[PDB]
């Protein structure tokens, strides 16, 4: 048998509601590495709302 | 939110916890939520006479909190305080304005319609539970979309739809009614059951999935 997967991502934010922010998710990246002295991540967001002012 | 449950014939609390959560071990939190002593379930009803509040028998209602609020002590305390009356917190309590339903139905969309009322004596009437939700839905449906002085886009454009009795007007009225009902987050969705157009007055009915 072949496994079935149904991903469901949730995002929480603490200083706009976090649930509304997580609805517009499209994709993200998370670069963590012990070789370098820094861990960095990136998040892609939709253009439905003007996030620059929020 | 929660799920209602009725005790089966000599049903086991651990079996209930396993059914409603999968893992059997969560029964320790459920009994604390229900605020029950060690005799969680007893077949004999006469045993409940000793400690009715802290003893459940067959056919007794029980509260099944969601998985997220299982270990929340505040949720446990609030559910213990509001056993069997927990629906009121979500739907809420509000002043009753449907003094007489026999009168204001005919007037329909117009001004000088509703008014507060008093039930019993002294204490002002307040509508709670499912009746409060029905009253809120009826008030939202009757009010125009842009009538109130604040937070516009509240109401419906039903009064503008009076006119020809052609089928497309009926479908437009159906869509407007469904849009108005779905505007409230407390209603999951709505759908038509039956429609009737006889004479010169539209008739129809709708069903709404009221939470809890």
């Amino acid at each position: 048998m072949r496994r079935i997967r149904r991903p469901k991502v949730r995002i929480e934010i603490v200083t706009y509601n976090g649930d509304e922010f997580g609805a517009k998710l499209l994709g993200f990246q998370t670069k963590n590495s012990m070789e370098d002295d820094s861990s960095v991540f990136q998040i892609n967001m939709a253009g439905d709302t003007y996030w620059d002012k929020l | 939110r929660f799920k209602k449950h009725v005790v089966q014939h000599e049903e086991t609390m651990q079996a209930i916890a396993q059914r409603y959560y999968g893992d059997v071990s969560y029964w320790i939190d459920l009994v604390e939520h229900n605020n029950l002593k060690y005799p969680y379930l007893v077949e004999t009803d006469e045993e409940k006479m000793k400690d009715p509040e802290r003893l459940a028998s067959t056919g007794d209602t029980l509260i099944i909190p969601i998985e997220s609020d299982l270990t929340d002590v505040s949720a446990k305390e609030i559910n213990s305080r509001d056993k069997d009356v927990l629906v009121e917190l979500a739907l809420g309590r509000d002043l009753n304005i449907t003094a007489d339903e026999k009168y204001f139905n005919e007037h329909g969309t117009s001004d000088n319609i509703l008014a507060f009322s008093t039930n019993g004596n002294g204490d002002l009437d307040t509508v709670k539970g499912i009746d409060n939700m029905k009253q809120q839905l009826q008030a939202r449906l009757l009010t125009p979309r842009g009538s109130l002085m604040l937070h516009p886009n509240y109401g419906s454009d039903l009064h503008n739809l009076f006119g020809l009795n052609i089928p497309e007007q009926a479908t437009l009225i159906e869509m407007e009614v469904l849009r108005t009902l779905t505007s409230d987050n407390r209603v999951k969705s709505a759908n038509l059951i039956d429609w009737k157009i006889q004479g010169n007055v539209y008739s129809g009915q709708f069903s709404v999935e009221i939470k809890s």
Binding site: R2, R5, R6 | I78, E168, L172, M175, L178, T182, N185
Partner: protein, 238 residues
């Protein structure tokens, strides 16, 4: 209802948003010759070295496409006598008006409402990138043809996602934060500096939906309101 013999056929009709408010009920006098509906899925398949993995993310955006021709002979209208060419020109004008006005990213008003009376179903639609393609070949010289493609946003039964009225129990706009901010603004600069000093000192000593009833989230608001009516130091705390 279709032409099943019990009820007469009902033709598909559109409902565009008018610029000055309201909607215009555009109705086709001839049903589309061809009707196609697609329901793509976001399922993806990836082959691992020893097993297949099936992963799904949910329903994708649907596509509605149809093609037809307008009538030739004149037919009466509810407020006039419009021929097929006039109907097609009006449809083109409405589509152009709806497309041009959407230069601000998206129109704040309602989207295009599609009413399919041939089979019981309703949708909220938007103009597809294919757009309104109009052609008239040598065959059938006096009959126009229109091709329309659309993308479904959601069922017309449900309202807008952002316009849904939440519970909003208690108070979403607490007065405690407002009056705390007003008091802090009214305080002198030295008072705010001493408040910052006290906050830093308290931070050093760490180690080494709102409702007044049945809620703890607003505990800090009540405490933050205090320490100004009572002089708990030369300024507030937290």
């Amino acid at each position: 209802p279709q032409s099943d013999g019990i009820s007469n056929l009902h033709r598909i009709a559109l409902r565009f948003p008018k610029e000055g408010g309201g909607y215009d009920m555009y109705r086709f006098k001839v049903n589309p010759e061809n009707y196609t509906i697609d329901s793509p899925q976001r399922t993806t398949a990836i082959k691992t070295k020893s097993d297949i993995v099936i992963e799904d993310y949910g329903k994708d955006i649907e596509v509605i496409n149809f093609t037809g021709t307008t009538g030739f002979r004149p037919v009466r209208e509810a407020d006039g006598l419009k021929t097929g060419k006039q109907k097609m020109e009006e449809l083109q004008s409405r589509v152009s008006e709806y497309a041009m006005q959407g230069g601000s990213g998206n129109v704040s008003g309602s989207y295009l409402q599609f009413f399919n009376f041939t089979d019981d179903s309703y949708y909220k639609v938007h103009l597809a990138p294919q757009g309104l393609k109009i052609t008239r070949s040598k065959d059938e010289p006096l009959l126009f043809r229109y091709e329309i493609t659309l993308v479904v946003i959601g069922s017309l039964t449900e309202a807008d996602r952002s316009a849904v009225t939440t519970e909003e129990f208690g108070n979403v706009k607490p007065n405690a934060s407002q009056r705390v901010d007003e008091g802090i603004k009214e305080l002198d600069k030295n008072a705010r500096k001493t408040r910052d000093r006290n906050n830093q000192e308290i931070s050093r000593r760490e180690n080494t939906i709102y409702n007044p009833r049945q809620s703890t989230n607003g505990l800090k608001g009540n405490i933050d309101n205090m320490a100004l009516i009572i002089g708990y130091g030369d300024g507030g705390v937290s």
